[PDB]
Tab-separated table of all heavy atoms in Angstrom:
chain	number	residue	atom	x	y	z
D	131	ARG	N	38.034	-3.338	-22.072
D	131	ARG	CA	38.321	-2.455	-20.947
D	131	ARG	C	38.815	-1.095	-21.421
D	131	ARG	O	38.333	-0.051	-20.964
D	131	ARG	CB	39.347	-3.112	-20.024
D	131	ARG	CG	39.352	-2.575	-18.607
D	131	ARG	CD	40.005	-3.564	-17.657
D	131	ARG	NE	39.682	-4.945	-17.992
D	131	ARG	CZ	40.359	-5.998	-17.558
D	131	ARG	NH1	41.410	-5.865	-16.768
D	131	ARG	NH2	39.970	-7.215	-17.927
D	132	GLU	N	39.788	-1.087	-22.337
D	132	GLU	CA	40.298	0.180	-22.856
D	132	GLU	C	39.233	0.938	-23.634
D	132	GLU	O	39.205	2.172	-23.590
D	132	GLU	CB	41.534	-0.046	-23.729
D	132	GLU	CG	42.617	-0.890	-23.078
D	132	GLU	CD	43.948	-0.788	-23.790
D	132	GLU	OE1	44.060	0.024	-24.734
D	132	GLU	OE2	44.883	-1.522	-23.406
D	133	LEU	N	38.346	0.233	-24.338
D	133	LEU	CA	37.257	0.923	-25.020
D	133	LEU	C	36.240	1.484	-24.033
D	133	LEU	O	35.687	2.561	-24.268
D	133	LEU	CB	36.587	-0.011	-26.025
D	133	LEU	CG	37.450	-0.298	-27.256
D	133	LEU	CD1	36.806	-1.349	-28.142
D	133	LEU	CD2	37.704	0.986	-28.036
D	134	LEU	N	35.996	0.786	-22.921
D	134	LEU	CA	35.138	1.335	-21.876
D	134	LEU	C	35.753	2.584	-21.258
D	134	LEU	O	35.046	3.551	-20.955
D	134	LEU	CB	34.881	0.277	-20.802
D	134	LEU	CG	33.552	0.327	-20.041
D	134	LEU	CD1	32.441	0.919	-20.895
D	134	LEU	CD2	33.173	-1.063	-19.544
D	135	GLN	N	37.073	2.579	-21.059
D	135	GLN	CA	37.732	3.728	-20.441
D	135	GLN	C	37.838	4.915	-21.395
D	135	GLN	O	37.662	6.063	-20.973
D	135	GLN	CB	39.121	3.336	-19.933
D	135	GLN	CG	39.141	2.799	-18.508
D	135	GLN	CD	39.209	1.287	-18.446
D	135	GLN	OE1	40.210	0.684	-18.835
D	135	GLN	NE2	38.142	0.667	-17.960
D	136	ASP	N	38.120	4.670	-22.674
D	136	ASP	CA	38.358	5.747	-23.630
D	136	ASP	C	37.080	6.154	-24.358
D	136	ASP	O	36.653	7.310	-24.278
D	136	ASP	CB	39.430	5.318	-24.639
D	136	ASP	CG	40.775	5.968	-24.378
D	136	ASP	OD1	40.799	7.164	-24.016
D	136	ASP	OD2	41.806	5.283	-24.537
D	137	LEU	N	36.468	5.211	-25.078
D	137	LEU	CA	35.245	5.506	-25.815
D	137	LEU	C	34.092	5.838	-24.875
D	137	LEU	O	33.190	6.597	-25.248
D	137	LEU	CB	34.896	4.318	-26.717
D	137	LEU	CG	33.520	4.223	-27.381
D	137	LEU	CD1	33.376	5.271	-28.471
D	137	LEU	CD2	33.300	2.829	-27.946
D	138	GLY	N	34.109	5.297	-23.660
D	138	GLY	CA	33.056	5.561	-22.697
D	138	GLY	C	31.800	4.766	-22.975
D	138	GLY	O	31.297	4.055	-22.100
D	139	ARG	N	31.279	4.897	-24.195
D	139	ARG	CA	30.165	4.076	-24.648
D	139	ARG	C	30.531	2.601	-24.564
D	139	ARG	O	31.617	2.194	-24.986
D	139	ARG	CB	29.795	4.462	-26.082
D	139	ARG	CG	28.543	3.801	-26.623
D	139	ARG	CD	28.611	3.690	-28.141
D	139	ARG	NE	29.681	2.805	-28.589
D	139	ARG	CZ	29.636	1.480	-28.535
D	139	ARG	NH1	28.569	0.843	-28.078
D	139	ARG	NH2	30.684	0.779	-28.955
D	140	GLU	N	29.625	1.809	-23.998
D	140	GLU	CA	29.906	0.401	-23.753
D	140	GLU	C	30.109	-0.332	-25.076
D	140	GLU	O	29.279	-0.199	-25.987
D	140	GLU	CB	28.769	-0.242	-22.960
D	140	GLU	CG	28.512	0.412	-21.612
D	140	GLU	CD	27.393	-0.259	-20.844
D	140	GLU	OE1	26.254	-0.294	-21.355
D	140	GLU	OE2	27.649	-0.751	-19.724
D	141	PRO	N	31.190	-1.096	-25.225
D	141	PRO	CA	31.469	-1.743	-26.514
D	141	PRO	C	30.422	-2.793	-26.856
D	141	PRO	O	30.184	-3.732	-26.093
D	141	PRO	CB	32.851	-2.375	-26.300
D	141	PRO	CG	33.442	-1.635	-25.141
D	141	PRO	CD	32.286	-1.281	-24.261
D	142	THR	N	29.794	-2.623	-28.020
D	142	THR	CA	28.880	-3.604	-28.579
D	142	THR	C	29.671	-4.763	-29.190
D	142	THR	O	30.783	-4.563	-29.689
D	142	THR	CB	27.973	-2.951	-29.628
D	142	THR	OG1	27.098	-3.925	-30.211
D	142	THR	CG2	28.782	-2.271	-30.715
D	143	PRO	N	29.134	-5.989	-29.125
D	143	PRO	CA	29.934	-7.166	-29.524
D	143	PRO	C	30.479	-7.134	-30.945
D	143	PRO	O	31.611	-7.576	-31.178
D	143	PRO	CB	28.951	-8.325	-29.321
D	143	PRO	CG	28.042	-7.858	-28.249
D	143	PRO	CD	27.880	-6.381	-28.453
D	144	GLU	N	29.707	-6.625	-31.909
D	144	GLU	CA	30.178	-6.616	-33.290
D	144	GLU	C	31.323	-5.629	-33.486
D	144	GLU	O	32.265	-5.907	-34.234
D	144	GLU	CB	29.021	-6.315	-34.241
D	144	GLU	CG	28.111	-7.513	-34.495
D	144	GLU	CD	27.105	-7.748	-33.382
D	144	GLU	OE1	27.070	-6.951	-32.424
D	144	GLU	OE2	26.351	-8.739	-33.468
D	145	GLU	N	31.268	-4.472	-32.821
D	145	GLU	CA	32.391	-3.541	-32.876
D	145	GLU	C	33.625	-4.131	-32.202
D	145	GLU	O	34.761	-3.905	-32.645
D	145	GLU	CB	31.995	-2.210	-32.234
D	145	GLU	CG	33.138	-1.253	-31.953
D	145	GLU	CD	33.613	-1.318	-30.514
D	145	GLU	OE1	33.212	-2.258	-29.794
D	145	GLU	OE2	34.380	-0.425	-30.102
D	146	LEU	N	33.418	-4.883	-31.119
D	146	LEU	CA	34.519	-5.613	-30.503
D	146	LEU	C	35.113	-6.624	-31.476
D	146	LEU	O	36.326	-6.852	-31.480
D	146	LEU	CB	34.039	-6.309	-29.228
D	146	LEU	CG	34.720	-5.887	-27.926
D	146	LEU	CD1	34.384	-6.857	-26.807
D	146	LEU	CD2	36.218	-5.796	-28.121
Side-chain angles (χ1 to χ4, degrees):
Chain D
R131 202 160 322 162
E132 309 195 6
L133 288 174
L134 210 29
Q135 271 100 67
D136 256 321
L137 167 70
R139 187 207 65 76
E140 301 181 300
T142 178
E144 282 80 3
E145 167 262 12
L146 241 193

